[PDB]
Amino acid sequence: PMEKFIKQFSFIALENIFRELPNKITHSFNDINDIKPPKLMYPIFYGSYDWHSSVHSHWLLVKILKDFSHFAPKDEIIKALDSQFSKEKAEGELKYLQNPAHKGFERPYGWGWFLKLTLEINLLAKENDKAEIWAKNLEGIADFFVKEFKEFLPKMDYPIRVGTHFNSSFALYFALEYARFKKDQELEYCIIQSAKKWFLSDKNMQALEPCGDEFLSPVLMEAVLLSAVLHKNDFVKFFKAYLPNLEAKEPATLFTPVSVSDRSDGKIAHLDGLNLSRAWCFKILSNFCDENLKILLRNNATEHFDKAIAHIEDDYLGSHWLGSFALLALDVDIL
Amino acid sequence: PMEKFIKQFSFIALENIFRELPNKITHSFNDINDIKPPKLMYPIFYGSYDWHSSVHSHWLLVKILKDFSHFAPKDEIIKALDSQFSKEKAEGELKYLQNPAHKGFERPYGWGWFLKLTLEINLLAKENDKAEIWAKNLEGIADFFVKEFKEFLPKMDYPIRVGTHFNSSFALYFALEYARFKKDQELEYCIIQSAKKWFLSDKNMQALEPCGDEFLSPVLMEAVLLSAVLHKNDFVKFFKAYLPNLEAKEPATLFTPVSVSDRSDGKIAHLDGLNLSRAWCFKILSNFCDENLKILLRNNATEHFDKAIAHIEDDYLGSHWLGSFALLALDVDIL
């Protein structure tokens, strides 16, 4: 069952990381000469349509290598990642990141996904010596993003709730996993304090969702971050007041997989990812529920997943990223 | 009182529209040679930090020329606009827009602001012979955006609510003004039908605002669009059920000017614009209210405006755009 998915995910992500065109850059500069093709600006992450999608397509391959290598073109993936994760190319990425004219680049979606990639590489490095070299070569970029989080989070009086790549909860969820693995107590504290400051008074959520270009659910992603930030007992109480009518399938929009009118439009194509990431969030949250609601949410997750899984290769505007959310949804630890 | 502001805004905008650096592009391409400095990609709108801010800095200058010329450096503005709005440069912008590899560029914020610019030029062309020529030279670009709107709105099953440049209500508010001036009945119908479909069931808004990078209020901007879409008596009934506790200043966030922790960060700097755009929206909405709520919202608007107006020149990350929102708020007809 996973066999078909892993083969498909492998093919997609391997094509993504090397595919140069089409591409979209979001690039600030104060020097007219600092306008170059992505291949030169981003020596590793130039493919997969944009920088952050290339990062998590690399993550998808690392995750497949760590946990699903029997289903995957293992040798091809290892050769591909080896030529990508070199010291010189990583120094090129760090050079772009550390240039003051590029301040704010990829905040926070690329930051969180990069820490998730670094985390997955370090976990693979527990058994694979090549991944220990990859982890060493990418350490400087990871340290850059950790520092940027520590510098920026204290400035955030307010969260960013929208279900696009600016979503605060998504990026901090991954940064928190990274922080706990690295035992970065200061990053962990910064994230926990920020989440509590922003979200602890949220209750009886309206959930005006989805919006036309969202690939994340504002209310679910926030709950998922808080499921890692709060103590279990505290989270269960918070969650019951947060969405108090879930057992009646309310708010109804969360139990209705979203419609996708045109997969050839880059923004509307995000809504396929919403059905996938809703499935992912529902599975995570199901582990904090009593048995009846647990199964209800997992059934809901499967209905959302099934509405999107068949379309992840319809268009490169989907296939350059949807595989990562499909695997995230599939791989949640069911407890 | 307006005198200081108009001379200030003119001073700011004339520097903006010709200032090349720093700059930020959001640029998609399917040809590796299609990566050029903004001055070549956008022969008119290469300045003022980014394409859409350049467009509405041009609007600010046109608006000043039309309605505040006694306070303005008219000869300098006319000379600047004359060299900007040439047939050759407009054809260059249109060439970029019509390239299929650039599909979706600047949707919808740049679209609405360009139609607002075109509207103001066409109004100025009733009295100024040079604006007649500018309007002819920009007509192809306006026609392009009108066509892209008519093509895309039927695909939007869901609105975009976030208070950033993806905000549907902001862009459609300006596009609707343009449509009514041009007597484009189809564009008007598209907008009205979209707004009704997206928003008519919204009631008792939670208003989890602001978020950290917003320069628009989701709930207010939506009400402002509906104030132009619905008949007055329908809007009055809708608005009362929409924010039922406004007369008791609830939700409290709408009566609290937002905090701006760091004006040197491009995203946090948006929060200065939010205080200004809230003031603008409150003034518009006050004209639809009974005397009690009218007075409350107008006092609230003044406090929001006063919290931001002094900071609009603190940093280029603000001055490349804040003047336009200051003028919008100052220019609302109090009825």
Q: How close A192 gets to chain B, by Cα (Å)? A: 17
Nearest to B178 by CA among B159, B191, B195: B191
User: Do B324 and B56 form a contact (C-beta atoms < 8 A)?
Assistant: yes
Which backbone phi and psi does B132 adopt, to 5 degrees? -50, -45
3 state SS of B28: strand
Q: Which residues contact A4 (CB under 8 A, 6 or more apart)?
A: none
Q: Do B207 and B143 touch, CB atoms closer than 8 A?
A: no
> Which of B28, B159, B210 is closest, CB to CB, to A22?
B28
Tokens 């046109």, located at residue = B62
How would DSSP label each residue in B293-318?
HHHHHHHHHHHHHHHHGGGTTS-HHH
3-state SS, residue B7: helix
Is the N-terminal amide bond of B73 cis, ω within 30° of 0?
A: no
Distance from CA of A34 to the nearest CA of B (A): 9
Rounded Cα–Cα distance for residues B308 and A130 (Å): 54
Whether A211 sits inside 8 A of B152 (CB atoms) is no
Q: Which of A205, A170, A215 is nearest to A191 (CA)?
A: A170
Cβ contacts (< 8 Å) between B32 and chain A: which residues?
A: 20-21, 37
Please choose, from the candidates A243, A220, A239, A221, the residue with its C-alpha nearest in 3D space to the C-alpha of residue A108. A221
CA nearest A102 in B: which residue?
A: B24
Burial (Cβ within 10 Å: 0-12, 13-18, ≥19) of residue A83: exposed
Question: DSSP 3-state assignment of B209?
Answer: coil
Breaks in chain B after residues (C–N exceeding 2.5 Å) = none
Interface test with B, best of A106, A168, A211 (most B CBs within 10 A): A211
Q: Give the whole-angstrom CA distance, residue A25 versus residue A321.
A: 15
Nearest-by-Cβ selection for B28 from A23, A213, A258: A23
A269 within 8 A of A260, measured Cβ to Cβ:
yes
Experimental determination approach used: X-ray
Question: Other C-beta atoms within 10 Å of A204: how many?
Answer: 11
Long-range (24+ apart) CB contacts under 8 A made by A144-151 are A144/A94, A144/A97, A144/A98, A145/A111, A145/A114, A145/A115, A145/A175, A146/A115, A146/A175, A146/A178, A146/A179, A146/A184, A146/A187, A148/A107, A148/A111, A149/A108, A149/A111, A149/A175, A149/A187, A149/A190, A149/A191, A150/A186, A150/A187, A150/A190
Distance CA B92, CA B327 (A): 29
Start-to-end C-alpha separation, chain B: 20
Q: Among B155, B266, B268, select the one facing A262 at the smallest CB separation.
A: B155
**C-alpha torsion sign, points B110, B111, B112, B117:** positive
Note whether A32 contacts B20, CB cutoff 8 Å. Answer: yes
Instruction: Compute CA A331 distance to the chain's CA centroid, rounded to the nearest angstrom.
Output: 13
Strand A23-29 versus strand B23-29 pairing type:
antiparallel
Tokens 């059905």 belong to which residue?
A275
**Nearest-CA distance B135 → chain A (Å):** 31
Closest alpha carbon to A43 in A109, A125, A111, A141:
A141
Neighbours of B87 (CB within 10 A): 12
| Closest to B25 in 3D by CA, of A168, A50, A98, A266 | A50
Cβ contacts of B106 on chain A, cutoff 8 Å: none
Chain B residues within 8 A of A25 when measuring between CB atoms: 25-28, 35
Q: Which residues of B touch A261 (CB under 8 A)?
A: 155-157
Which chain A residue has its CA at the smallest distance from B260's CA? A157
- Which 3 state secondary structure label does DSSP give B258? coil
Angle at CA of residue A115, ends A111 and A118, nearest 5°:
140
The answer to whether the CB atoms of B156 and A261 lie below 8 A apart is: yes
Separation between Cα atoms, residue B1 and residue A324, nearest integer Å: 56
Phi, psi of A27 (to 5 degrees): -140, 120
Query: CA-CA distance, B311 to B269, in Å (whole number)?
Result: 10
Chain B residues with beta carbon closer than 8 angstroms to that of A30:
21-23
Contact A155 B265 (CB under 8 A): yes
Residues in Cβ contact with B179 at an 8 Å cutoff, skipping those fewer than 6 apart: B146, B185, B187, B188, B191
Residue B240 vs residues A102, A281, B244: alpha-carbon distances, Å: 46, 35, 5
Give phi and psi for A23, each to the nearest 5.
-155, 155
CA distance A198 to chain B (A): 10
Q: Which helix (H) or strand (E) holds B205?
A: none
Q: Which of A161, A217, A270 to mutate to test the interface with B (most CBs of B within 10 A)?
A: A161
Q: Torsion angle, CA of A285/A291/A296/A300, rounded to 10 degrees?
A: 40
What Rg do the C-alpha atoms of chain A give, in angstroms? 19
Q: How many CB contacts within 8 angstroms connect chain A with chain B?
A: 118
- Phi, psi of B164, rounded to the nearest 5 degrees: -120, -165
Give dist(CA B77, CA B112) in Å, integer. Answer: 23
For residue A209, give the nearest of A125, A281, A139 by alpha carbon: A281
* Partners of B42 in beta bridges: none
Cβ pair A218, A162 in contact under 8 A: yes
Of A26, A104, A261, the CB nearest to B157: A261
Q: Which amino acid, B73?
A: P
DSSP string of B67-128, one letter each residue:
H-GGGS-HHHHHHHHHHHS-HHHHHHHHHHHH-GGGTTTTTTHHHHHHHHHHHHHHHHTTT-
- The distance of Cα B172 from the centroid of its chain, to the nearest Å, equals 10
Under 8 Å CB-to-CB from B256, ≥6 apart: which residues? none
The CA–CA distances, whole Å, from A279 to A9, A254, A308, B72 equal 17, 10, 10, 57
Residues 6 or more apart in contact with residue A240 via CB below 8 angstroms: none
B280: helix, strand or coil: helix
DSSP state of B201: T
Instruction: Nearest by CB to A166, from B22, B213, B258: name it.
Output: B213
Give B268's DSSP letter: T
Report how far residue A288's alpha carbon sits from residue B231's, in angstroms, rounded to the nearest whole number: 48
Q: Please give, rounded to a whole number of angstroms, the shortest distance from the CA of B280 to a CA of chain A.
A: 22
What are the C-alpha distances in Å from B201 to residues B158, B204, B245, B248? Answer: 13, 10, 18, 23
Cβ contact, residue pair B213, A259, below 8 Å: no
Q: What is the resolution of this structure in A?
A: 2.1
Give dist(CA B326, CA B319) in Å, integer: 11
CB neighbour list of residue B70: distance below 8 Å, 6 or more residues apart: none
Evaluated on CA atoms B224, B225, B226, B229, the torsion sign reads positive
Residues 6+ apart with CB under 8 A from B295: none
Q: Do the Cβ atoms of A29 and B23 come within 8 Å?
A: yes
Q: Pick from A255, A289, A280, A277: which is nearest to A332 by CA?
A: A280
Residue B277 near residue B216 (C-beta atoms within 8 A) = yes
Q: Which two tokens stand for residue A319?
A: 């296939």
Contact (CB<8Å) A104/B28? no
Q: What is the dihedral of CA A124, A111, A158, A214, to 10 degrees?
A: -90
- Interchain proximity B26–A31, CB inside 8 Å: no
Q: How far is B163 from chain A (nearest CA, A)?
A: 9
The full length of chain A comes to 335
Domain boundaries in chain A?
1-153, 156-335
Sign of the alpha-carbon torsion through A196, A198, A203, A209: negative
Q: How far is the CA of B320 from the CAs of A303, B2, B17, B105, B199, in angstroms?
A: 47, 20, 9, 20, 32
Indicate the DSSP class of residue B37: -
Q: Tokens for A107?
A: 């905040």
Long-range CB contact pairs, A231-236, < 8 A, 24+ = A232/A288, A235/A288, A236/A288
Half-sphere exposure of A271 (CA within 13 A, CB side): 24
Residues of B in contact with A20 (CB under 8 A): 32
Q: Under an 8 A CB cutoff, do A268 and B155 touch?
A: yes
Q: Torsion over CA of B93, B99, B104 and B107, rounded to 10 degrees?
A: 10
* HSE-CB of A299 using CA atoms within 13 angstroms: 10
User: Could B211 and A30 be called an inter-chain contact, meaning their C-beta atoms sit closer than 8 Å?
Assistant: no
The 8 Å CB, 24+ separation contacts for B49-52 are B49/B16, B49/B19, B49/B22, B49/B23, B49/B24, B49/B316, B49/B317, B49/B320, B49/B321, B50/B23, B50/B24, B50/B25, B50/B26, B50/B320, B51/B25, B51/B106, B51/B110, B52/B106, B52/B109, B52/B110, B52/B113, B52/B165
Residues of B in contact with A256 (CB under 8 A): none
**Distance (Å, rounded) from C-alpha A126 to C-alpha B5?**
63
Secondary structure in 3-state letters for chain A: CHHHHHHHHHHHHHHHHHCCCCEEEEEEECCCCCCCCHHHHCCCCCCCCCHHHHHHHHHHHHHHHHHCHHHCCHHHHHHHHHHHCCHHHHHHHHHHHHCHHHCCCCCCHHHHHHHHHHHHHHHHCCCCHHHHHHHHHHHHHHHHHHHHHHHHHHHCCCCCCCCCCCCHHHHHHHHHHHHHHHCCHHHHHHHHHHHHHHHCCCCCCCCCCCCCCCCCCHHHHHHHHHHHHCCHHHHHHHHHHHCCCHHHCCCHHHHCCCCCCCCCCCCCCHHHHHHHHHHHHHHHHHCCCCHHHHHHHHHHHHHHHHHHHHHCCCCHHHHCCHHHHHHHHHCCCCC
- Give kind and range of the element (H or E) at residue B254: none
Phi-psi category of residue B314: left, alpha or beta, with phi > 0 → left and psi -120 to 50 → alpha: alpha
Residues in chain A within 8 Å Cβ distance of B166: 164, 213
- Which residue in chain A has the smallest CA separation from B19? A30
